[PDB]
Amino acid sequence: EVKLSGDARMGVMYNGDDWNFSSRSRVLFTMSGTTDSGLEFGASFKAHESVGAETGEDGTVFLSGAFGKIEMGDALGASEALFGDLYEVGYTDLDDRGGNDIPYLTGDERLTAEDNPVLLYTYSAGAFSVAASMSDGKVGETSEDDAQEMAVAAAYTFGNYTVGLGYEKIDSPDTALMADMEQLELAAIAKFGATNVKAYYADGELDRDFARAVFDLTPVAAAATAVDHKAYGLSVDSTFGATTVGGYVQVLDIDTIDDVTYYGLGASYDLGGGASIVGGIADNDLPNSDMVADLGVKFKF
Amino acid sequence: EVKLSGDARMGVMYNGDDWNFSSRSRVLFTMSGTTDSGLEFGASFKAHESVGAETGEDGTVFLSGAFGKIEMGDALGASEALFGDLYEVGYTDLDDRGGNDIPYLTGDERLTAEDNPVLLYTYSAGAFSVAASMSDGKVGETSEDDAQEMAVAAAYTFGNYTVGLGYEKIDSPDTALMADMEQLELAAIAKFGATNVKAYYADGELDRDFARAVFDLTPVAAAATAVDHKAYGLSVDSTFGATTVGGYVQVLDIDTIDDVTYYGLGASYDLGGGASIVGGIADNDLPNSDMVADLGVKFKF
Amino acid sequence: EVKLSGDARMGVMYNGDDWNFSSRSRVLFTMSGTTDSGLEFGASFKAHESVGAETGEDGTVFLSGAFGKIEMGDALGASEALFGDLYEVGYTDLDDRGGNDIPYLTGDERLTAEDNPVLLYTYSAGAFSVAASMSDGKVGETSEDDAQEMAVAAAYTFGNYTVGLGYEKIDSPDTALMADMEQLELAAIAKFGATNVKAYYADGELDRDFARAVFDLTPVAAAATAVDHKAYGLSVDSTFGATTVGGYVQVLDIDTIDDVTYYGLGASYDLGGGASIVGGIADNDLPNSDMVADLGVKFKF
Numbered sequence: 091e092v093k094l095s096g097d098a099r100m101g102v103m104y105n106g107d108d109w110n111f112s113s114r115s116r117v118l119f120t121m122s123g124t125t126d127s128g129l130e131f132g133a134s135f136k137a138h139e140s141v142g143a144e145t146g147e148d149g150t151v152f153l154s155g156a157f158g159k160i161e162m163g164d165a166l167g168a169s170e171a172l173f174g175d176l177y178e179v180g181y182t183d184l185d186d187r188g189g190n191d192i193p194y195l196t197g198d199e200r201l202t203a204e205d206n207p208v209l210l211y212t213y214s215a216g217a218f219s220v221a222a223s224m225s226d227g228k229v230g231e232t233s234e235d236d237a238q239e240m241a242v243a244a245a246y247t248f249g250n251y252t253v254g255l256g257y258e259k260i261d262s263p264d265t266a267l268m269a270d271m272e273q274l275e276l277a278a279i280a281k282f283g284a285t286n287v288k289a290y291y292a293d294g295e296l297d298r299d300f301a302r303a304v305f306d307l308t309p310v311a312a313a314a315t316a317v318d319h320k321a322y323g324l325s326v327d328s329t330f331g332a333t334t335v336g337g338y339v340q341v342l343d344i345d346t347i348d349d350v351t352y353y354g355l356g357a358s359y360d361l362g363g364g365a366s367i368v369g370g371i372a373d374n375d376l377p378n379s380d381m382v383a384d385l386g387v388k389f390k391f
Numbered sequence: 392e393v394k395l396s397g398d399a400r401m402g403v404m405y406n407g408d409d410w411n412f413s414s415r416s417r418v419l420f421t422m423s424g425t426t427d428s429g430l431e432f433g434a435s436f437k438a439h440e441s442v443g444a445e446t447g448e449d450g451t452v453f454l455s456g457a458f459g460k461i462e463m464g465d466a467l468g469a470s471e472a473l474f475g476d477l478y479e480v481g482y483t484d485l486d487d488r489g490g491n492d493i494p495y496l497t498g499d500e501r502l503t504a505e506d507n508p509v510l511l512y513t514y515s516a517g518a519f520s521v522a523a524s525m526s527d528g529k530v531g532e533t534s535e536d537d538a539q540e541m542a543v544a545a546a547y548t549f550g551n552y553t554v555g556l557g558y559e560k561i562d563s564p565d566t567a568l569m570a571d572m573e574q575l576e577l578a579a580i581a582k583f584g585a586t587n588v589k590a591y592y593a594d595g596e597l598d599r600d601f602a603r604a605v606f607d608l609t610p611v612a613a614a615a616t617a618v619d620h621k622a623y624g625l626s627v628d629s630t631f632g633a634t635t636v637g638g639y640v641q642v643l644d645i646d647t648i649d650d651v652t653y654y655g656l657g658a659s660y661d662l663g664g665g666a667s668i669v670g671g672i673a674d675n676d677l678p679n680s681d682m683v684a685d686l687g688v689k690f691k692f
Numbered sequence: 693e694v695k696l697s698g699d700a701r702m703g704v705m706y707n708g709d710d711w712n713f714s715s716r717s718r719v720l721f722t723m724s725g726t727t728d729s730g731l732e733f734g735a736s737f738k739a740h741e742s743v744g745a746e747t748g749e750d751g752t753v754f755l756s757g758a759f760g761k762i763e764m765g766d767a768l769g770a771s772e773a774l775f776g777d778l779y780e781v782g783y784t785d786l787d788d789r790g791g792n793d794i795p796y797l798t799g800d801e802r803l804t805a806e807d808n809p810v811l812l813y814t815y816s817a818g819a820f821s822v823a824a825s826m827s828d829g830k831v832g833e834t835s836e837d838d839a840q841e842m843a844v845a846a847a848y849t850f851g852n853y854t855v856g857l858g859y860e861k862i863d864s865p866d867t868a869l870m871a872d873m874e875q876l877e878l879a880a881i882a883k884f885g886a887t888n889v890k891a892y893y894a895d896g897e898l899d900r901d902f903a904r905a906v907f908d909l910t911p912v913a914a915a916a917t918a919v920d921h922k923a924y925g926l927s928v929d930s931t932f933g934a935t936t937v938g939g940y941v942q943v944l945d946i947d948t949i950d951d952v953t954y955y956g957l958g959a960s961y962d963l964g965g966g967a968s969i970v971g972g973i974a975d976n977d978l979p980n981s982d983m984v985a986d987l988g989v990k991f992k993f
């Protein structure tokens with residue numbers, strides 16, 4: 091069975107200097123089935139991904155059961171599968187100055203995307219959850235000696251709160267050229283009525299020149315070094331009636347290289363029916379940074 | 392909600408010299424919704440446009456209400472939104488020698504396409520209609536100082552006839568390189584039973600070397616000059632029973648550069664059910680021009 | 693009317709040296725309609741082919757009736773339309789070492805693919821079938837003097853068996869550069885309960901350097917020569933309960949150039965519901981050849 095859903099948005103966006111019209115529409119194909127013993131299986135991808143979904147680069151395929159779910163394709167990484175990301179600000183998701191996303195190292199469309207189809211395993215039992223993920227250590231089916239990437243996370247919900255932790259590791263095929271990167275994450279999610287609060291603290295080590303490239307700095311002509319980093323952040327959103335207001339603030343401090351605090355503030359008004367007016371503002375504290383902002387309508391079909 | 396429709400055609404086509412098989416199939420995704428106060432909203436794009444529809448280059452998004460409809464994306468331009476184009480000849484739309492389309496300067500996939508998402512506003516009240524359109528004056532969200540393009544049109548239906556007028560203007564970012572282009576259009580549409588008659592007269596001014604490029608002439612190594620042009624044409628089609636016969640003739644006279652009359656004659660036979668046999672013939676009076684022609688079946692699903 | 697179906701698979705694949713995750717998902721658009729006298733017409737293409745299906749390179753359009761079916765697009769060639777191919781081994785279709793496909797010269801995505809939309813005509817009456825196919829002798833609608841390719845096949849079912857024959861011919865536009873290629877095929881299909889047996893014998897002549905390129909050999913700096921070849925093979929599959937086991941073996945002997953025998957063995961277990969576990973092994977006898985193999989699940993929606 092194949093079900094269709096879709097979305098669209100339109101409005102105006104300020105990129106720091108000019109306003110521009112911004113719009114889009116997408117269509118999602120969700121396919122499902124149950125085997126005779128009650129195993130579930132399915133697949134989904136958006137229409138603009140038809141081509142990569144046909145090679146396993148985009149879209150995901152899965153099979154679940156009493157043993158947990160195995161998913162393959164552009165599967166999220168284990169930590170991000172359990173904890174997700176922060177309040178999404180702006181109708182276009184105002185990612186320009188850093189975004190609402192938690193800086194997960196692996197999985198998805200993140201640092202490991204070249205590796206795809208990656209595999210995600212997840213399993214819950216009552217109030218606990220575990221997730222583990224990895225590439226094959228080759229570039230999909232072309233047996234390329236590469237990035238072996240992997241992650242593990244686990245959570246525990248106790249009433250109102252989930253708290254969890256995860257570990258992500260990216261192995262370098264030539265550490266004289268690229269240090270291995272690793273990160274440890276702790277996250278705590280709390281819902282109190284119409285308010286959601288999500289907070290995280292991650293720490294680990296990054297390859298020097300990847301870290302210098304994050305902040306847009308030329309690399310240094312030397313062998314690879316690992317620098318230490320710690321990241322952390324918070325979003326709060328609440329809904330009153332049909333109005334949600336929310337924001338987030340996060341910091342990345344990569345030691346010996348630079349520090350940035352980035353943030354955003356947004357609001358939505360639900361017109362009911364699948365449409366809402368959404369608008370937002372995000373920025374960070376580095377040097378250049380010019381706020382971006384937007385305002386428009388978002389539609390779910 | 393997401394509805395699917397689609398089309399397909401197949402037959403043989405004569406390009407001036409040889410016959411070739413010609414065929415295609417397309418699928419259109421139409422998505423709709425109503426908000427709690429009865430505002431309508433939607434989005435649509437064809438499957439082969441999944442990629443550009445995801446950036447706002449292809450497909451359109453809209454929101455309508457008592458105030459009129461706002462549409463954003465590859466929106467038609469205001470004049471073309473009210474008056475449309477002439478009898479479509481041939482199963483492949485025999486556009487080779489000039490086509491059935493009225494030479495609108497803006498909107499759509501026309502001279503302004505780079506500008507997209509462009510915006511179209513339309514509003515009717517009883518028997519009158521207004522439409523206005525424009526780009527943002529940037530290249531979508533990449534704030535590129537460019538083509539500010541805009542148009543306005545209005546119509547009035549009085550029984551059997553609509554008559555209307557429109558104005559289209561394209562501003563040059565460096566008039567020493569490209570003159571501004573403008574056009575004024577008047578159109579009159581009349582339905583008399585099973586006969587439709589559409590006629591227009593447009594006039595204005597074009598950039599010299601754009602006009603020379605239309606007729607496929609090298610440009611002249613000089614600063615930009617505007618040349619004056621006037622365009623006009625007519626189509627008539629009628630249906631008897633299951634057979635429609637129709638044609639059009641149009642002329643473009645760009646002063647000091649060249650004149651062309653182009654035309655076409657076609658017929659359809661409806662097999663009922665969404666299929667019809669369609670065939671046609673088009674040509675113009677320039678020098679080379681070898682008639683193109685075709686014959687095949689067209690299918691709507 | 694537009695119906696959606698789709699498929700997906702996931703598992704691990706061994707390419708001769710390494711195992712890799714391999715997965716995909718696809719969506720097929722099938723569109724149909726009946727005219728007032730009961731002619732059927734339709735079109736279909738997969739989502740990842742939206743772009744070529746819009747030019748007639750991918751997907752097919754058709755119109756059938758009492759006269760037979762005419763199909764245009766990426767239509768299969770006449771022989772392959774009647775006889776199909778051998779047991780498909782492996783969840784990814786383990787085509788690496790030669791595959792389960794019978795070496796048809798024309799149609800489809802085979803040697804004639806550049807030619808597409810190609811045309812297929814088929815007609816059955818009781819127990820007999822005929823099929824004929826061809827390109828236009830141009831490169832679709834760009835009138836390119838090329839490959840005129842064509843084929844004819846016919847079959848006869850007598851109870852338990854179909855036996856048939858076909859002829860395929862590819863004409864060279866410069867025989868000093870490329871010999872014409874031709875092939876004659878005989879095939880016999882037999883179903884005995886849950887067992888299917890398919891066998892073929894083809895023979896003809898190939899262009900020398902195409903034949904040398906098949907076996908991956910540099911060509912020889914001389915004018916084109918035709919070499920003679922004969923191909924033949926067999927697959928057997930049977931289902932016991934929910935387990936199907938099957939395999940095939942085929943040989944290509946191109947005279948004065950090289951001989952290869954290629955084969956594969958696979959099995960499926962049906963989980964019911966559209967999912968099955970499939971796995972397989974294929975290889976050939978040339979020199980390098982390292983077996984490929986796979987194991988995973990396949991899903992139909």
Ligand SMILES: CCCCCCCCOCCOCCOCCOCCO
Nearest residue numbers: 186187188193304305306342350352374
């Ligand atoms: C710890 C691994 C991080 C991996 C993902 C990168 C996280 C990026 O967000 C942090 C930085 O703030 C935004 C980027 O700063 C660069 C300049 O602004 C962009 C235009 O020049």
Ligand SMILES: CCCCCCCCOCCOCCOCCOCCO
Nearest residue numbers: 487488489494605606607643651653675
């Ligand atoms: C007034 C602005 C016009 C902007 C759109 C162009 C209108 C084109 O149709 C008129 C010309 O007739 C067809 C083209 O003539 C050129 C040569 O034929 C094509 C193959 O060489």
Ligand SMILES: CCCCCCCCOCCOCCOCCOCCO
Nearest residue numbers: 788789790795906907908944952954976
């Ligand atoms: C008679 C016309 C044949 C036209 C289609 C080609 C048939 C290919 O299958 C036969 C050969 O066996 C597989 C290929 O052998 C080449 C080397 O292996 C591949 C990796 O190097």
